[PDB]
Amino acid sequence: LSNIALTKETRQSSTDYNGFSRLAVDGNKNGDYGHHSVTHTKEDSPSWWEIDLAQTEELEKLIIYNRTDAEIQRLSNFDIIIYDSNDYEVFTQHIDSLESNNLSIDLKGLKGKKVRISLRSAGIPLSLAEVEVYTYK
Ligand SMILES: [Ca+2]
């Protein structure tokens, strides 16, 4: 397995507090906001974040690392949406809440090019410490 998320092109609904979208693919899973490795949107309707894998890949695993210092509850009631190279949805999963600072999803070789994480409660900022996307097997 290799983490092909690293340094892929990212974007998000908006940015607050220097929480750039790229911070979720910098290879640093520290969720303490002041360690400067956690994304942050404004209070959007909805807040979302997206990664472009640059071409279609066989996806083995997705790992999402939450913020940990404060407001950890914000990463809850959300959707993970995977799209093909033509921007059509190929997979959706709804998440009620995280119990630990992270969630792992096996994708069993699902082919996709883009991954969006989008909150279903409007007004809530999205903050991610790290989103890792594994291919290989
Ligand atoms: Ca990070």
Cα separation of 45 and 43, whole Å? 7
Q: Ligand 1 mean position to 120 CA, how many Å?
A: 23
12 C-alpha to center of ligand 1: Å?
15
Structurally, the chain folds into a number of domains equal to 1
Q: How much distance in Å is there from the Cα of 50 to the middle of ligand 1?
A: 14
Q: What is the resolution in angstroms?
A: 1.8
Q: The domain containing residue 80 runs over which residues?
A: 1-137
User: Whose CA is closest to 60, among 4, 118, 117, 11?
Assistant: 4
- Going by C-beta distance under 8 Å and a sequence separation of 6 or more, which residues neighbour residue 87? 114
Q: How far is ligand 1, taken at its centre, from the CA of residue 36, in Å?
A: 8
Phi and psi for 35 in degrees, rounded to 5?
A: -80, 0
Task: Evaluate whether 83 touches 68 at the Cβ level (below 8 Å).
Answer: no
- Ligand 1 centre to CA of 90 (Å) is 26
Ligand 1 centroid to residue 64 C-alpha, Å = 10
How far is the C-alpha of 90 from the C-alpha of 100, rounded, in Å? Answer: 27
- Residues, CB within 5 angstroms of ligand 1 (ion): 23, 26, 28, 37, 130
> Position 111: which residue type?
K
Give CA–CA dist 45/13, Å, rounded.
9
Please state how this structure was obtained: X-ray
The CATH code of the domain that includes 115 is 2.60.120.260
Contacts of 91 (CB under 8 A, 6+ apart): 80, 81, 82, 107, 110, 112
